[PDB]
Design a protein around this ligand. Structure first.
Ligand SMILES: CO[C@@H]1[C@@H](OC(N)=O)[C@@H](O)[C@H](Oc2ccc3c(O)c(NC(=O)c4ccc(O)c(CC=C(C)C)c4)c(=O)oc3c2C)OC1(C)C
Length: 194
């Protein structure tokens, strides 16, 4: 529900981890990647691309199946409901992307599959309009890009390349075969963990 989100916004730290030391802020990046890494362990994703935007926004693009689009879409459901369809200083593990959505001033969702492109925009967890096809494609994959809420995150508010590179590096190693790339639009630094 709408309340479901209210609860998250009310006590973010309980779900995401500490909101003042940079922990929660970077964990917002990790949950999304973990979702992509799961699509890879499933056998459908081969490459993951993680980009830091100079507007202090982070995007994660994958070439997996694309969250099912058909009918509210199931994708909308994954983005707005707590442990959708199931059950559950670092906050929660596998908290779900709905929690990253709720704690985001803005989140943009882009999905490709079945020859189409679908997009939807949310604000503080709320869809600003329905999910719609915007064009045609031959590729498949999910792209999530979000802008953390400044009413939730204090003190350490800007993403830091070093923190992500250490973890993405660990993730590729522990998940042999998965290719993850990291790019810093702020300075042109890029990394490829294989
Ligand atoms: C964040 O969404 C994640 C996905 O994340 C990424 N990055 O792909 C991924 O981690 C995993 O993705 C799944 C997990 C299960 C199915 C899955 O069972 C599919 N097969 C279907 O036949 C199907 C077709 C229509 C439909 O409404 C549903 C149920 C919807 C679900 C499970 C989200 C499933 C499918 O097409 O894609 C799937 C996908 C893409 O689970 C989600 C949806 C929570």
């Amino acid at each position: 529900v709408l309340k479901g989100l209210d609860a998250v916004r009310k006590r973010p730290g309980m779900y995401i981890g500490d909101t003042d030391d940079g922990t929660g802020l970077h964990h917002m990046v990790f949950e999304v990647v973990d979702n992509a890494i799961d699509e890879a362990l499933a056998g459908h994703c081969k490459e993951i691309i993680v980009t830091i935007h100079a507007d202090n926004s982070v995007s994660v693009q994958d070439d997996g199946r694309g969250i099912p689009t058909g009918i509210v879409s199931a994708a909308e459901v994954i983005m707005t409901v707590l442990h959708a369809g199931g059950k559950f200083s670092g906050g929660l593990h596998g908290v779900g992307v709905s929690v990253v959505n709720a704690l985001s001033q803005k989140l943009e969702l882009v999905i490709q599959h079945e020859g189409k492109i679908h997009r939807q925009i949310y604000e503080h967890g709320v869809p600003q309009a329905p999910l719609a096809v915007t064009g045609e494609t031959e590729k498949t994959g999910t792209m999530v890009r979000f802008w953390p809420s400044l009413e939730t995150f204090t003190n350490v508010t800007e993403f830091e390349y070093e923190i992500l590179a250490k973890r993405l590096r660990e993730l590729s190693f522990l998940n042999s075969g998965v290719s993850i790339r990291l790019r810093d639009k702020r300075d042109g630094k890029e990394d490829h963990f294989h």
